[PDB]
Amino acid sequence: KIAFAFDIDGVLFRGKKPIAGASDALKLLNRNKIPYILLTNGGGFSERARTEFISSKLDVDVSPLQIIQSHTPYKSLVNKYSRILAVGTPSVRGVAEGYGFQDVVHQTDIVRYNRDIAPFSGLSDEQVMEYSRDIPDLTTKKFDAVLVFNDPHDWAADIQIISDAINSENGMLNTLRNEKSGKPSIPIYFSNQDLLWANPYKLNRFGQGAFRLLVRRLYLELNGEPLQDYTLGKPTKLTYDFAHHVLIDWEKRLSPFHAVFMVGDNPASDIIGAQNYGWNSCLVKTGVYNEGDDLKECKPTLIVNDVFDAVTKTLEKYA
Amino acid sequence: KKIAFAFDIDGVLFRGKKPIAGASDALKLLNRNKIPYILLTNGGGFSERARTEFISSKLDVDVSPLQIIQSHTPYKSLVNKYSRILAVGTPSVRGVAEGYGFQDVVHQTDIVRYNRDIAPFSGLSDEQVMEYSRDIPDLTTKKFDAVLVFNDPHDWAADIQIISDAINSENGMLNTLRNEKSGKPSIPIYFSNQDLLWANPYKLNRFGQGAFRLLVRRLYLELNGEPLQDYTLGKPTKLTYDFAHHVLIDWEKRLSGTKPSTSPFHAVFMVGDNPASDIIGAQNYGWNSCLVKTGVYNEGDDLKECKPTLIVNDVFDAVTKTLEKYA
Ligand SMILES: [Mg+2]
Ligand SMILES: [Mg+2]
Ligand SMILES: [Mg+2]
């Protein structure tokens, strides 16, 4: 009994385009009745909307119950925080609402309220109108946490607005505390520490890990203490435990494994994540990693060209 | 030549587009008394002419384009040094750079237009790409010679990605990545303002180009394991104060037609809102200073090593109290 956990970016897709072999890889598992999940540090859309897109592109039925995205574990926080600043692309508002967050504010809602809060926002008037909403108690009800769902697309605004929140007086908009501290005014969560990721471009691009480093750098500058943030996403144990539960529930719904193989392109997320958790791993060369790159101390079970190689070589050798 | 003033703009004369109460009156007071002044700002984006036209209209005084130093004004000295520059800032900085004489100006939005996948987290709308960017001859086949940050750009995920690409490239060629790690960037990079904070219309101080610089530097360190060797101008740098001193000298000569740092004046008073730029800059250069409370500085904030000559409420108090004591 083996199962697979596939990364998406640099393994199944580059952007919206499938990698050759990705469709065949999943079709092969389905023929053989081998369970799989998708475990991605990407996000932005609902689990349903994302799996609908992947299903269409790869010509397989991927269930919303087979996927863990960066933000999926934020379901665990819905009873902890009444009002959240949900940072990400505009779609993350709906995702957070769907999880059951009581009071969701998107960062663009603050830009709508007062453009002078974010002097270097690139939002056009049309983008403000489309992306944001009027929040009538934006200034009178405190924020309880900042949750970064995915990489937002207006960083001078996004970073300013996050900084305002984590240096505020107890989460109240338009306030600035006097006290310097490593503990932010309200808690802040990052869902992906990937410095780099693989999109259609030939060179690795910065991801949410890079965004996090930037937020942290300015927090340190203002406070003289490092930020006490929360982190999820691969390689964190929290995300692997979450994925493990999704996989167990999926395996039951198909109806515990001798081995789980993480298939990834990034040593620093996928491979270390699996290795720390006790999962096996197959490092592909179609994304962040190029053969010759420093593996440091991760030790992938197999190193292979692409996802179809990962599945076929793993099955031949281990199933 | 008893005295001249050098005024900061943001948090001293203006908050955003709105004059601070007394700002117009302060300049009119100097002009009635034939006391010369310059404007020395770490802001920028538009030409010295366009900027002084706007300020003139809003303060109802005649400010000459020869009376202003903006963050990027000293980039005039670099025009024969670097053929192709990545001119980073708001779209208006393309025209400012071209106006200065740079041979081959590329704006960061030109690279986003060339390939959107370079900047996956760009916020540019299609309409903004059409408005801001240009097709650039030989974008992919001619090296970039430097990155010059003119002012704060307004799409930082793209801006930071694109700057990082340049300073880690194979000798400035787009679409490349060098093999080696070093403190020395692939091509030189200049920042024109190290202001962590600045004062706009909002009541809380907002991050400025100094913050942007710290972000670029952080990701450079992450990729290279060595701190970035950059060039920095703007207040409080000696380069910028020297440049401003020469603009003042030239302006006084024009009008007319001591210490080394104030020549030909007995005293030069910097009027600023930011201890970390205006005050320490003036102090290190040899100028006197007035610190106002209408911008970044709040009463009781720690002044660290800065010792302003006077601390006052606003720009009109700065002028009136300085003239009383020092004129
Ligand atoms: Mg990946
Ligand atoms: Mg935009
Ligand atoms: Mg100022």
From Swiss-Prot, chain A:
Q: What class of enzyme is it?
A: hydrolase
Q: Which GO terms describe its biological process?
A: glycerophospholipid biosynthetic process
Its primary localisation, in coarse terms, equals: mitochondrion
Question: Source organism's superkingdom?
Answer: Eukaryota
Record's keyword terms, sorted: Hydrolase, Mitochondrion
Query: Which GO molecular function annotation, any one, does this entry have?
Result: hydrolase activity
EC nos: 3.-.-.-
Q: Where do the TM regions start and end?
A: none
A GO cellular component term found in this entry reads: mitochondrion
InterPro entries, alphabetically? Answer: CDP-alcohol_PTase-I, HAD-like_sf, HAD-SF_hydro_IIA, HAD-SF_hydro_IIA_CECR5, HAD_sf
* UniProt-annotated location(s): Mitochondrion
NCBIfam families hit by this protein: CECR5 (TIGR01456), HAD-SF-IIA (TIGR01460)
Q: Which family does it belong to?
A: Belongs to the HAD-like hydrolase superfamily.
Additional detail: Present with 3870 molecules/cell in log phase SD medium.
What is the name of this protein?
Mitochondrial hydrolase YKR070W
The organism named in the record is Saccharomyces cerevisiae (strain ATCC 204508 / S288c) (Baker's yeast)
